[PDB]
Amino acid sequence: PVVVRGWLHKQDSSGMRLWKRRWFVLADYCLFYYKDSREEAVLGSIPLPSYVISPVAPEDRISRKYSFKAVHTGMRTYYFSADTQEDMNAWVRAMNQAAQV
Numbered sequence: 001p002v003v004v005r006g007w008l009h010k011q012d013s014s015g016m017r018l019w020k021r022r023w024f025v026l027a028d029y030c031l032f033y034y035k036d037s038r039e040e041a042v043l044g045s046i047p048l049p050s051y052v053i054s055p056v057a058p059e060d061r062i063s064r065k066y067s068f069k070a071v072h073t074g075m076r077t078y079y080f081s082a083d084t085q086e087d088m089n090a091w092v093r094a095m096n097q098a099a100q101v
Contacts, residue, residue: 003026005037011080029098032045049098050099051071053069055088056069067080067088
């Protein structure tokens, strides 16, 4: 059921350049996020169908290392950052596989 789980920083949706560390789970074609890795009470969800996920580009003007974005096909863009390059790459690949269902 779960494809991948782990910590990501997520940028706030109001453009204040604030990053919050949440625990993410990809399951059922969606991202679910939680306060921590206990996976107790889901805080929110981003269903992935039709999103395109990629490492950030220069024009995104994101400074945080290992950052990537999910763009809704802009209807809405989410920015995430992982703690390692390997984990970034694994999330981009998993999220695109789900989004391309």
